[PDB]
Each structure stands twice: as structure tokens, then as C-alpha cells.
Amino acid sequence: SGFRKMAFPSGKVEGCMVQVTCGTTTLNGLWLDDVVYCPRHVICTSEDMLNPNYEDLLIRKSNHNFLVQAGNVQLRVIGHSMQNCVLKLKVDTANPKTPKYKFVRIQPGQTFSVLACYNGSPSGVYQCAMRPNFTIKGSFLNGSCGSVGFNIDYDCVSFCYMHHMELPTGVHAGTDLEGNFYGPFVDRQTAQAAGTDTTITVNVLAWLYAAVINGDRWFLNRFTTTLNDFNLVAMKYNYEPLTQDHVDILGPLSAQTGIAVLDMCASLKELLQNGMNGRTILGSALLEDEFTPFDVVRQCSGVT
Amino acid sequence: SGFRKMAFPSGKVEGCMVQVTCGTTTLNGLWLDDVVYCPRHVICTSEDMLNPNYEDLLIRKSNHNFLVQAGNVQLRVIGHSMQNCVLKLKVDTANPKTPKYKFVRIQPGQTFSVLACYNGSPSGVYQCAMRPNFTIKGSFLNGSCGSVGFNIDYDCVSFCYMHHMELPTGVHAGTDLEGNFYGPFVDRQTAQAAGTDTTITVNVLAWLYAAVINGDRWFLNRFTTTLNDFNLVAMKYNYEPLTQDHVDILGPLSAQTGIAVLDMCASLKELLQNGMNGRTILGSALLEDEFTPFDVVRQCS
Ligand SMILES: [Cl-]
Ligand SMILES: [Zn+2]
Ligand SMILES: [Zn+2]
Ligand SMILES: [Zn+2]
């Protein structure tokens, strides 16, 4: 019993973190095989970030401009290239601690663990979701650029995020490991606003199932609704539409608790209209949307 | 910017997790040097749940009755002893991944990271606090016994918790690594209940300072309070009394934000009176109490 915001064990990723310096700019890098991946803005000063031409900034640099440190050991840079908003530094040694890994791009609503790093040193690990507006509500301070987000499936690390910046509202933006931004953002110190965010409906539903599994049943309504009638009420409270795909994804949890998906939708519809009436669900006074149906099954099934 | 329930990187503890089996009971063990530490109830059969005499159950065991597995390798048990509620299994091989470590006993209100494990394999990591009633609000299923709680500083891993049981309310109980239970709990399946859980006041105040550091001040007010009037009000909401030691511990956060401790106490009194009114603080619609003043400082600066 119990339900927590749980992150993947971070050991496989800790062995990949390095410090990358270019001039006076220092951030984190990810060392896999004989390559170090980091944000392309490592080649910028504060002044360059106002309006950078990364093509020109990189063309005016050589292997000598980059200093990579894996703890106390310096790694020799023998090649460099840019792939979108990430810089790839070829080094003379393959990381002996390279785990089985792949680079994956996630969709809004999906979750991942972040290993916050400073000067190549891991400081903490936490779980977050990619918002429908493509930002992440992280916890990052200066020097955290290059920190990565990941999931683990069996013994394979799927890297999905590399941290690049903080937007005016204090939320965060980054890219996948191939340097493609999530969201309509650019790596430049300019006026950038995160769009209006919405609630990940399928995740709130999965979390209501976790609450039932843990004995919280006060909110249950069994006057079955339809997907169409639920969506009409849901869109009014800034909730993402619930697709039939989402309903199918909720199948295993529905069978486990004896609560049909459209009965949980009826329960959520009333929760939106009434509010929580001074009550809590799983230790929260709001409807949590950063747990996917797979996170709920995994945590309520003890998968390793 | 931002504020999250952050755990310590779990790598150094993952390299210590092993599986321990005695008969048909399997749980987790912690392998440090040539010793594996695990809950002593690994020696219990179905008839030993209510009133086990562990000294009598253990005297009947030989080294070869304990099966220890680290990955795909069986470790040979060459000795065994019991210290309070933990069993120490001496093995013939020292863990080459043993980090620098210490065993510490934490106090209520303090936080630590838990590495949830099943069959010696880590499944996830989360942060939690020792409640004033000496229970933890963890996330543990059948097979999680032996999972540990820890903190990391600049030199060592400080192990502070080993998981042993779940209570009827869904909360958890365990011991330090010397086998001493936190609270009045025992390793028996007799009906036990956790005392009234109160809110960790000093932690709520630390979290309000984190909200101010992160740019939010909506909840502040123009008042102050004496420490006694604050305690008389806060105790009516099941909050633990705030001591002068707690006031002094909040000093650096008070100096960073320019908000006197007793002025933050006045804000907290008003928040208890009014609630959130549809607002949130650091993404929460409740007053959060599982962040210590040090967790706030680490994350905010
Ligand atoms: Cl960049
Ligand atoms: Zn940066
Ligand atoms: Zn057990
Ligand atoms: Zn230490």
C-alpha cells in the first residue's frame, strides 16, 4: 500500500554524467560510448545568448576549445559536430559504464525521471511529466543545463530529455537527445512564453484508480456516462479530450478494481463540478495528473 | 526555479541490494563489505507471525539455510548473528561496490530517500519523512521488506531506515540499521495502530520560505505573533508544537527572504484559518510538511 511520486533508480545514468567547459561557460554532458552530448549553447557567452548564430559560433571553434571532465579525469576531445540544438563531442575513450540505451522522443502526458546535475555531479532525482504545452515543471538552478530525463524498461535506459532553459514563469524547456526542442521554444535569451496548459485527463483517471486500489472510494459515482458527454464537461475545465485509445489504455486498471472506465469518468465529472468538498485523494487536495496508467500499474504491481 | 520532492541519486545504494531467502520467505538484504543486513523475520514460517521467539527460531538455523543472491551469483553464508530486529549474515566475499557509509538514527520530521526493492532488484526511488508518530508514508508492496532509506552528504551514504512492516492504515514501520524500531512498533503480526499523526510545523514553515524564494508571496500578511500564541492556534489544527530550536533552525531562510520567523508563523496561522481559497502554493493545494529547512536550502540555492 501507499502511493508516491516515484522516480526510476538513477545509477545507470549517474555513470554517464560529465562536466563540459567551453571558454567560461560550464554545463553538464552525457557520455555514452565515445561521444559526449550537451546543449549547443555551451559555445555561447551571456552576450552571445541574446541573438546567437550557432553556425558562426561553432565555425569559430576547434576541438581545443572544449574541456570535458569525467570526475577528476580529463577526456580528450578529438571531434565535434552539431545535431540540431545538441553538440556531439567525440572523445578518445569509450565510457566503460555505458548502459544499454536508446534515444526516444516522448509525447505530452508521458512521464520520466530527471537526474538534476551540477558541474557533472548528480545532485538529485525526481519524477515529472511533459506538459500538454511541452514544458516541464522541473526544479533546476544555474549550472543544471545538460541534465537528462529518462525511463528504464528492463535493463535499457531510454533517454528522452536534455535540459536547456527556464521560461519567465519558472517552468522549463528542453530537447530530445537528437536536439529537437519539445515545444515552440528556441535556445536564445529572448521573449518566450509557455502556452496555456491543460490537465492530462487520462493521467487523472489512472490516479483515481490508484486511489481506489489504496482504499479511497468516497468519490465513486456509478451512473455511467459516455465518452462524448464526459468530453463536453471536461473541455470546460481545461482538461485534454479523452480518446477511445485512452479508454483502452485504462483497461487493465479497470478490470483490477471492478470499476468500468466510464464509471470512473462519471466520478471525475462530478469531482470537477463539486470540487473535493474539503476531502483529499491519496494525500492530495487537487487532481494529480503526473502519473500515467503504466506508472500506476507498475507502482501498484512492484515491477523492477 | 521550481520545487520538487527530490530524492538522492540511488546508484551507490543500488550496488548494495541483494535477495535473501530462508525457507519459502524471500526479502531484500543490504550487502556492505562481507555482511548482509536484513529483517530478522526472514526466518519466520506461517506459524511464527503472531508470537515469534526469534532467539529460538534462529538457534535452529545453520549458515546453509540462508540463500543470498547478488545478481546472478549465489553468495556463501559463513556466519550469522542477530542484533535487535536485524539479522547480520557474514558472507565469504566483500561487496566491491560498497560505498563509504554510516548507520544513523533519524528523528521525526527528518527526510530521507527510499530505494523500493523486490527480489533484490531496485524498482524506484522516492523521498519521504519520518512522521511525528514514528511511521513513514511509503509505497511498499509484498516483497519490499529489507528496502532501505538513506541520505547522502559529501563523503558518505548514511543509512537510516530498513523496512519491516505495514500497519492497518497503509502506513509503514521499520528500524534503523542497528535493528531498533522507530516508534513503539514490534515485528509481530499482532494488531498494532499508529498514534495520531500530527503536521511537521517547522517543515511547513520551511516550505513557505521556499515559495517566497521562488517568487510567490500571496499568502503573507502584515501581522506577527508570539511563539506561544502561534502554538496555541497551530495545536488546534493537529500541528506539532514549534520550539525555539525550530525558530533558530529557520534563521538562515528568514535572513535570505527578509521575513522574520514569527512573521511567517502569522502567515501560517492565517492559511490554517482560511485555507487556499482555490489557490496553490508550489503546485500544491495542501500545506506540505515533508521538506526540512535543509531540503529547501539545497534545492532553492
Ligand atoms: Cl542550446
Ligand atoms: Zn545553459
Ligand atoms: Zn516481510
Ligand atoms: Zn558523511
Curated annotation (Swiss-Prot), chain B:
Q: Which reactions fall under this protein's catalytic activity? A: TSAVLQ-|-SGFRK-NH2 and SGVTFQ-|-GKFKK the two peptides corresponding to the two self-cleavage sites of the SARS 3C-like proteinase are the two most reactive peptide substrates. The enzyme exhibits a strong preference for substrates containing Gln at P1 position and Leu at P2 position
Locations listed in the record: Host cytoplasm; Host Golgi apparatus; Host nucleus
Cite the location of the cross-link Glycyl lysine isopeptide (Lys-Gly) (interchain with G-Cter in ubiquitin) from the record.
5, 90
Q: Where is the active site?
A: 41 (for 3cl-pro activity), 145 (for 3cl-pro activity)
The entry summarizes how activity is regulated as: Inhibited by pyridone-containing alpha-ketoamides compounds 13a and 13b. In turn, alpha-ketoamide 13b (tert-butyl (1-((S)-1-(((S)-4-(benzylamino)-3,4-dioxo-1-((S)-2-oxopyrrolidin-3-yl)butan-2-yl)amino)-3-cyclopropyl-1-oxopropan-2-yl)-2-oxo-1,2-dihydropyridin-3-yl)carbamate) inhibits SARS-CoV-2 replication in human lung cells. Inhibited ex vivo by michael acceptor inhibitor N3. Inhibited ex vivo by compound 11a and 11b.
| Ranges per topology, Cytoplasmic | 1-301
Q: Enumerate the spans annotated as Peptidase C30 domain.
A: 1-301
Q: What is the effect of changing residue 142 to A?
A: Does not affect ability to cleave and inactivate human TRMT1
Q: What does this protein do?
A: Cleaves the C-terminus of replicase polyprotein at 11 sites. Recognizes substrates containing the core sequence [ILMVF]-Q-|-[SGACN]. Cleaves and inactivates human TRMT1, preventing tRNA guanine(26)-dimethylation of tRNAs. May cleave human NLRP1 in lung epithelial cells, thereby activating the NLRP1 inflammasome pathway. May cleave human GSDMD, triggering alternative GSDME-mediated epithelial cell death upon activation of the NLRP1 inflammasome, which may enhance the release interleukins 1B, 6, 16 and 18. Also able to bind an ADP-ribose-1''-phosphate (ADRP).
Subunit structure, interactors included:
3CL-PRO exists as monomer and homodimer. Only the homodimer shows catalytic activity. Interacts with host FBXO22; this interaction promotes the proteasomal degradation of nsp5.
The protein's name is 3C-like proteinase nsp5
The source organism is Severe acute respiratory syndrome coronavirus 2
- What high-level taxonomic lineage is stated for the organism? Viruses, Riboviria, Orthornavirae, Pisuviricota, Pisoniviricetes
Entire protein: shown range: 3264 to 3564 of 4405
